[PDB]
Symmetry: C2
Subunit: 470 residues, 2 copies
Amino acid sequence: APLRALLDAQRAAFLEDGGVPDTLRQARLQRVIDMLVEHHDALCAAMEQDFGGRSRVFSLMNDVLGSLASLKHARDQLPNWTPREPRPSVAPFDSFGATAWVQYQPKGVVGIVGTWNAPLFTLFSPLASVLAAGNRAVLKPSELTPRTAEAVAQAVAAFFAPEELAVVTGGPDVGAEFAAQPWDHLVFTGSTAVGKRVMQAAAENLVPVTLELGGKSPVLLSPGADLRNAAERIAVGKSSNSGQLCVAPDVVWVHESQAQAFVEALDEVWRGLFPTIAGNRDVVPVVNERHFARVESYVADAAERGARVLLVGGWPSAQGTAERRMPLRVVMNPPADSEIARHEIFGPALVLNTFRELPQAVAAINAGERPLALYYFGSDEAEQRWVLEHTLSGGVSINDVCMHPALHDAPFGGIGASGMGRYHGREGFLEFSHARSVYQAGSHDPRREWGMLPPYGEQFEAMLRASVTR
Amino acid sequence: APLRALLDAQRAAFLEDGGVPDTLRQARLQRVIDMLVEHHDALCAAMEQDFGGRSRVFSLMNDVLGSLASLKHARDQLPNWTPREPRPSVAPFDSFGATAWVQYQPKGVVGIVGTWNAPLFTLFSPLASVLAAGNRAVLKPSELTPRTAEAVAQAVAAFFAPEELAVVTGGPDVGAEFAAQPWDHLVFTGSTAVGKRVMQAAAENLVPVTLELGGKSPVLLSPGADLRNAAERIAVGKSSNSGQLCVAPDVVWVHESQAQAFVEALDEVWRGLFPTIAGNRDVVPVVNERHFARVESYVADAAERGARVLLVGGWPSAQGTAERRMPLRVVMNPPADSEIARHEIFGPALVLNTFRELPQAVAAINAGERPLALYYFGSDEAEQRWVLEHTLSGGVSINDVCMHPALHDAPFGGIGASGMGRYHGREGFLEFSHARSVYQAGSHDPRREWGMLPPYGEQFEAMLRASVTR
């Protein structure tokens, strides 16, 4: 009842809104920016405590500045997106004055369900597109970052009336009720398995959904790639948030003859990034004991099944285990029925699979679900093109990892099991708009003269038949 | 299994296509064009007999030429849609050579479920966009047009290998198995209630959907509108297919003082279009006795509840009833709990609601579900703008009805209960494509030398804080 009452109040205000001018959308976006600028110290502290020691430097980059960048881009660019677009109209009536256009209008009240790994970005980066399109919104921060959820709730209550932007906090019971409301559009970031249940819940009210989901993002290492450079970039991206990123490298494909050299370079880079693991505040802990036991169970299962497990970047210790801070474990060619071959790792472990011929790796990728991200390292344009043409992933980075979601003017989203829909840029503006085609009649209707109206003319029928051509 | 075996055969062949060049997509579209050109007379005969007398002129114009025009537009225009689109890359790394683009790739195997009221158009017009995007497809014609379904199946089997394009026929049991398959995309046209169940079925496999559904499409008659011109255009569009169109005018809103003039004009026009009703091959029958009883019960139920019912365009007769050919019945101001106020008519009856101030009509529209189409007649540009700004519908026609789905270069689809997603034009190409964002790294990575890598120093932190600005 209280959640529905909030949706109804936003909807009542929207139906009185009518048109939502550019400058009102920009003012709303500016208000969100001003709120984050005012509250970012409290927000970084909350994120740190929620993880049990997540670096405020990483939070500032990933969640605070990442969100601010999305919001500013939408603020500054949306005047280019709102104008209507004239289109050719229906021939031959356009020869008599008929015209046409597409106009974009907000859908109304959008719900946004965030996740815990980037608990501001997964709320405020989709919000930037949602507000640019002229909607009102309700945010549901993750209960796995409850200090952050509460700081976001207090901050929005201080800056916004609830009819314009509101926050709902609570456990997964609240989230479930959230997903069942008749929104005009629902955005969800989270696991593939939960995304299915979100879509089932949305189906009850025909709510369109943006689902940003998961998978095992592969890296393809060209047999001709600079292995030392690839190891550096992959180490930086994989160690970010201790692998707790939706686009983190999950499986690396490397030529058999280059596996050892790659792991050695990966280890050297990682030890230079993290000279200690236990007690190192730069190492992001696994968010909680549940997810720590999850990741560790994949590693232990792989070892029991006979896969070789390598330590990269340090040694485990009692204290690191207690802090949920770990070096990278690399699992070589795990069996297809092992847990780590079948689940998203989302943590400090990595699968390293070897190949003889790069099409062998592409075939394995294609036999699995389509990942949110796919990566290719190399310098052979023909090979790069072949890999992309014969795969499908949500997005791609070439000669780096984890970079394409930071593109403001390109869509960010999945495909297949990694999700549907997108946000960011003009594509994200379109996602939360209805594209409304309009035909406008001309002055003179020639149908009656031409015999096109019943009782139908024989000449008209003759002309219809002469129009059936290749 | 047979249905799944066919999907798997198409999927296996898709994975071997790799890239799908423009010219292959054009050849596929041309083969569909050639098939329809070769078989259109037999298809029009099947459609006539399935309805018990649907005009071969109407079928030729709407199902045959409508489908052909969509396919030829996709064939001729797709080389404009497939090129990759460069985009600004991620700052500051674009100052170091990083680049980006969006590339479009087919999703794979698309299922298309058609309906009976336009049994070719609702298969082949979405198919045009599906094939333009590089996909393979399976079609499910409506079983309410069984001769047409069979003719489509035989025509496709004569012209196409089933791994490229195939047809499945059968009743609701087949339709349910069809909606449960793991397509890469599913297109469904039909009622809102069945669309809900389709979306529920798709959720189990995270299948993205294009749902083209229903509602009660309203006409707003400005008090300044030319009433005779509006009556003429509305009579023509409402009598098309005897109202069995997803964008047919369903409710007309008229100022109280103009209702009589409008109904008199509508009658005069309708009698000119159909001087007789019974035995008149120009009058499309209601497709079968079930839908005939449905439509007639809405009329009866409204009169039983006190609503005035007016005859437009002729007088009912025993012969007309047996043929399922009727004059228009106009139901005035029916109560909100009447069947005709709550259901899509989709036949030869129309609700006429009166207003004293035009905003009353908009308010009532906004209190119901969002319709697939909305129409405005008038000459006041400001009033026209106000109406469109304060309503939302799939599409719109101004000073005509039923025209905007014939736009080749604008999307066609619904919003809210009238559906989600779209086809036609570049928008339809994009519907059945994945838009894959790609970041490509530059030569020199500046992060290390700028202190952006762990171990995190205080100067990097200071630079981050200095970036937190309005």
